[PDB]
Design a protein around this ligand. Structure first.
Ligand SMILES: [Mg+2]
Ligand SMILES: [Mg+2]
Ligand SMILES: [Mg+2]
Ligand SMILES: [Mg+2]
Lengths: 508, 506, 503, 505
């Protein structure tokens, strides 16, 4: 059974990984990794928002099934995740970094978690479908990140990711001490970074890499409010766009710092692989690179996520290691597919995970078997007044919301999604295609039931959270475990035995 | 707004409270409390098992709604409980003792919890409908408690309840120091004891009180296996009855220690009343006495709970204090009613709690209003192979399981439930009654959907729990908070100001 | 004096022999040989092309010294080879199979050659540094081997190797009949197979062994032309890469047949060991296993050789038999070291071979003495426009061409050579290392003189070959040499049978 | 394009051809040929020994460039020769007879070779500069040929040359059958005889032609060892001079048989000319007469070659045929010039041969353009302990060896090379001349680098050749080719065969 190192980053636009990292990015370690990887060019989040994407990623289940509709929705501890599936199959499992789990369970199957979460674990960020058009300024996104972009040597997120990286490498070193043990458990370590998520603020060393960058403005620029589709209009309102003057310089500084923070992450990818190499674990380790959702990065005038356009919904996915054929795949894939893919790679039978996952294993695709299943996405959080769903199949993307006109995009003819074929069909094929997707949509979702479930979930939490914020607060944030009385040299141990057990490799 | 003291005990057969405590029980404090209480004689659990009853009790929702089907089912933290409702209305809320909450949330709205739980917080005790007939010896009930009944000066449960009682009285004393503060929050303290739940083992002092007891044998004796209804048969097999030789003396000793432990609790009730009296909080404090489920106590040959017979499904309920007219109420009520009753007593509008509670406030009842709503019960844990549901309305009890013959009892004519009218109707009224109950059951429950929901919950947990018991274990048990650097006299405080703030009355 | 059996194969990627054959290969005979061998994990060709590698192998001399720069360069008969060295010390020496010797001398010291060569002996395959960028389609490598991989029960190469094997085993039987006369010379037999060189076509029996194989794709995928280093770009045009559509199925079928052909060879290794065992010559016989160069096998998008990346430049080397302690050695070694190692094992003095070899004996090192000399490589044939040289020492590989950026790899940190530390050093030590390798390069090669000598050799041959392909062709192909075999009436009929019999 | 017939003989003293053959020689065919020839009176070998001279002759390159330093040195097959140059231009090229090519390549560009070589093809005759003063008796020259001169009707060499002649004439006839087919390639046939090389033994018919010969003793007689220049001393020690009593009679017998064997050869020249005439190819055919090196023939007391004196270093050179103006040329020329002359005569461009030849075409000289380039010679085989070089320019000859005193000769004033002007200069002109030659010598050769290259070549071959003579020997001698395709066979047309093999038709 191979080891599994999952490297995850937050808010990474998948279009920036056309075939591994784009040429213009300074990312040598991720480019070298990509050359060894199966690379999934058209990979999509299951939900363009942090907590919904991450609960779905861990479970291999859609938000409608996990019930994690938004960034404040409880994730039930009884829902199996890839950590349960691997741990049940004999893996040691650990998390360093972020997963935005909401509720008192901050492990969800992970045997050990090395850091707290950067974000809250409580019900604060609960949207309210009963009050459409409101925004909550103290947690909603706003374009202050765009006007505030720049250069700093420490930030909240760099403190977090610096520590995530250090503890991940320390854990790989600790795990190598078991390498000569016949009865060692294989390990699965998830390293989950908060970059390149905003604030768009970067260390000067990485900012300086992009002085001459040719990609600091999007090809598709700002669409005025009057000309936006309704959901995009709700996002602009939710971001308080009217109270910010986003200049071209602001767009350029934000994209520049974002690219710089990819380069910041690339250095951390190199450290992890160097640790794997020197500990002699690289040949037995699968490495997956993934992200929860994208960032529009100013394309269409939009920033951040919360929508199904390519920049928000596309996220990179790469897998490398024993038994994995390197190569590029264009068939659309989903983050929903990661958990069943990991289970398959770990030797777990299809039947053991079939009842618990909505995705499919990608391993047959890596081995030349055509994948046919469509890619499904959902969104039911801020800037929605009712749930949205999307279907990505073949060359098409279809988006449905009961409150909006449908969208239908031919991504091979129209990769920038500039012509809505549901409004302006090119011919009778486009009209027949729209009908097929409507049928597919009715097959997969009951939208009235979806809306009612989201409303009931919000209403529960508004009662409960108001109560929990009265009197003394009981926090749910993960506190990594204290072990000082059992670490290093203590006088209930054999002193020379200790040094030998903590040294690795041995006898050289 | 009044203070609220909830006194809860575990596994207390409600037939023992015909009008407050039965005369033969040595329970002067509970009898004194009962005389000033609204007493609900025919009060029922929502589910005859610890965790399902308690989650349903806290939320005012049935197990089919809480999803807490058994003793290992996760109780979601987003479900509102009476703690949340009161806390949202401005109450300080606290729990001392047991609530058998499963999952990493061990507060469920309680602002403070003073003890850990006596029982596990994890998914270990999960039944499996895919293996009907199996029992799990390491946690299932078994009749060893009947054959091992006796006397001891300390037990696991007396250690627990002794501590529950001390910390509750300590908290009342601490709360009295705020009495003179016009800006104080009113308080709601739940004090939840594990007795008289088995093992049936009592301190000598209380065991000696029942030397001449005349209720040491049940009136309805052991029904042989072949004559038992199918569910009772499933219970006997789950208790491993074949491997125990339960003598008449075992029955008497179990019941004697059980009664003694009611007397053990009565002493603790008096302590709490005494603390309320001397702190001058009694007259502003509502007092509720309740239990999660009953105990058959050998009636029909059965022990413990897990069924809808009277000894297992009946639990006492009493309410006393400001605005509560004393009196005995015979109309059937249930534990589902406690949470909306609490909200009502605390001045919370019916509209604020309507979407979150399946029961009804008993306040109107206390003030003379006739109550008509029926009482519903559910069971879907060990010794069931498919869910069971019950309906209690007027003089009738109806019990349904897809796999079993229906049961229908006229508790007015047949309070010991010896004649099943669904099998042996007395006439056309009994037949029409059965039909009315079938139609009403079919409108309230889809029992096939109920069964599918229970099986999914079990299967989920069997995957998850096996994983969580591999490698290092992460416990969810509640750990009461440690505040020693901020307690008593510390040198960041004014040392004479401290003594005055900690003194009361002043 | 021990007998010496040299088993050589063609185009075998040394990364497939990490400690003997890799576990995933079906090769029980080579795994059993390895277990009693000194095994040289990091052994390198001296030049990643057939004839340059083989002339250098035979002489223990680099191409810059043999002058065999490419696959059409004459190998002078006056250059001593290990066959001369052993033959001078009293050995009977013979070759069965391929050595790709160019020119009229097809023995180069071998007393007897049992087969012709599979490949040409003339100046046809001559490159020309005056036309940098051309390709010659009728003999250049091309990716048709990759798109044409598969299964067949006979091929040109299997016909050849079947015969190589038969005659080698026949010769071992013949050599066993002299095994009772103390007056008999020790023997050195070189058995040189053309597999696993492409075509990637295998017998179905061996193809079937790899249905479940987990290694049918390389560890590094195809790198687009624009992202390749300049020499890799030259190679990619060389094989006309743009005129082939290499699918993943093509990659898988090519690697599967290649592994199948390793298994095909393993059966022949087992046959040779069986003959040694049954004739009772095994215990007195040194066995060496070697190859001329590797095969990239689709790694980086490259096939075949002509470069210094691991898959092309690494080749296996194992030695077993009397006086050889088994073990795995990680210090880099060279095919250049085979000839002085053979001479040393044969009791020849160091001074007798010192003037004629650029490598070193590996025997001290089998016996625990640390080997410090670096490993040197050269390439000056097709897809080069000027000579390339490489140095392998410690954990490092350094590659220099006057026309290209340097390459520097740390193979312990970067075994797949995905980070060029000359362009992208990690820190100060990488810079100091690059400088030291530049100093070492200057101490070993005059690159201007190298290029001039290559150009003069190419130009000579272009004049000569045009002339030689006018009029009647005189072939140089070796023809092995009936009226003296078996029972003939000028011999003693009864005495003959007892002489042909053994034991 | 003209046909080309190269008639080559071995060890013919060039002073015997002062204007074609000397008057006293019975050589009517070679004198008839000479009269229609451009004749190069002062023509020199490139190296006074068989294999080195011949490899240099074939390549138009000096030994230091061919690497063929001695009679056992491998001649690499990748070195272009006039055979390659002509073959590349469309010629059929063939050799009948000797060329003393060493190594497994016995064609060196020739498309067909009609005989094997009379001498070995392997590394046997290798000198060793590490053993100066030693001699290897089983192949070194010795003066036994001088004492054993005489008369016989067959010899090894006459068997050989008889066969060379027969097959060469047979081949000319075969080539004439292609005359009427205007599609045929032009041909170049090299006919290379072993005479007048020793043994000095002749058929009685030719021996009787010199009964009254007046040139049976050399003008310059024997020089005693103690008065010889150091190289001549090394030659005498290597010929084992101390073990032979060479009488005046021995000299006369040797020189008589030698002249007789020139007459033996002249008969064969007549045969070739007669075949060309009767086949009607004569007018379209260039005829070149040449030799590899000379023979001292007793002059100065020396025999054979291995030195730069006139008798060993001069060889005849004549060219006749279409476009060749007859006449005598005195400017010094070199065997190095044959290959570029042949190429020029075949219409090959100057630039196609310039990188490959150290000599110059003689066609401009034939056509009245003065030639100025000097004549260079080298020697690095037996009787040398380090390489020797020589320069021949205008009237002068300069000889250098690092180990010996220089020699400088004014061949106009001193045609017999009796006065060494480097030791006994006549005045400042001789001194400035010597200095000019020193400077010239130093610009052309690094003699230490030359010595090192020779030593390495010797040392290589000592390792190899010992090996090759253990166990079964594999020979490199040329074996000429097919009887099942000759004459009348029952897959051909019988009436078609006779007509195609008949000529004239
Ligand atoms: Mg995110
Ligand atoms: Mg209970
Ligand atoms: Mg090869
Ligand atoms: Mg000669």
């Amino acid at each position: 059974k191979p080891n599994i190192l999952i490297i995850m980053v937050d808010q990474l636009n998948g279009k920036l990984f056309p075939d591994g990292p784009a040429d213009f990015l300074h990312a040598p370690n991720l480019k070298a990794l990509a050359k060894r990887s199966a690379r999934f060019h058209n990979n999509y989040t299951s939900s363009p928002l942090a907590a919904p994407a991450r609960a779905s990623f861990m479970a291999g289940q859609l938000p409608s099934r996990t019930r994690v509709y938004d960034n404040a929705a409880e994730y039930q501890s009884s829902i199996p995740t890839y950590a349960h599936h691997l741990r049940r199959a004999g893996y040691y499992t650990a998390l360093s970094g972020k997963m935005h789990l909401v509720g008192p369970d901050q492990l969800h199957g992970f045997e050990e978690r090395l850091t707290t979460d950067i974000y809250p674990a409580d019900f604060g960020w609960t949207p309210d479908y009963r009050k459409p058009g409101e925004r909550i300024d103290w947690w909603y996104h706003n374009l202050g990140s765009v006007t505030g972009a720049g250069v700093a040597e420490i930030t909240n997120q760099m403190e977090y990711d610096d520590e995530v990286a250090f503890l991940a490498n320390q854990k790989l070193y600790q795990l190598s001490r078991e390498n000569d043990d016949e009865s060692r458990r294989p390990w699965c370590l998830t390293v989950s970074f908060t970059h390149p998520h905003d604030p768009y603020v970067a260390r000067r060393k990485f900012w300086d890499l992009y002085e001459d960058c040719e990609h600091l403005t999007p090809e598709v620029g700002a669409i005025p409010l009057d000309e936006q589709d309704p959901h995009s209009q709700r996002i602009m309102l939710s971001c308080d766009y009217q109270n910010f003057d986003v200049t071209e310089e602001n767009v350029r500084r934000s994209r520049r710092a974002y690219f710089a923070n990819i380069s910041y992450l690339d250095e951390k990818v190199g450290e992890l692989i160097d640790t794997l190499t020197r500990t002699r674990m690289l040949d037995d380790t699968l490495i997956l690179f993934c992200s929860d959702h994208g960032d529009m990065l100013g394309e269409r005038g939009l920033w951040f996520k919360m929508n199904f356009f390519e920049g928000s919904a596309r996220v990179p996915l790469m897998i490398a290691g024993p038994g994995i054929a390197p190569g590029l795949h264009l068939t659309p894939t989903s983050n929903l597919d990661v958990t069943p893919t990991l289970a398959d790679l770990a030797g777990i039978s299809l039947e053991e995970v079939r009842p618990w996952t909505d995705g499919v294993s990608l391993v047959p695709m890596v081995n030349g078997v055509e994948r046919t299943e469509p890619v499904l996405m959902e969104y039911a959080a801020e800037a929605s007044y009712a749930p949205l769903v999307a279907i990505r199949e073949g060359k098409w993307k279809y988006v449905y919301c009961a409150l909006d006109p449908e969208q239908l995009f031919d991504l091979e003819a129209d990769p920038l999604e500039l012509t809505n074929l549901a409004e302006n069909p090119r011919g009778p094929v486009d009209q027949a295609t729209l009908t097929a997707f409507r049928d597919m949509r009715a097959a997969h979702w009951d939208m009235e039931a979806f809306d009612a479930a989201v409303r009931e979930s919000q209403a529960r939490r508004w009662v409960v959270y108001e109560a929990l914020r009265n009197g003394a607060y009981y926090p749910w944030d993960h506190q990594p475990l204290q072990k000082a009385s059992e670490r290093y040299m203590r006088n209930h141990m054999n002193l020379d035995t200790l040094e030998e057990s903590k040294r690795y490799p041995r006898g050289e």
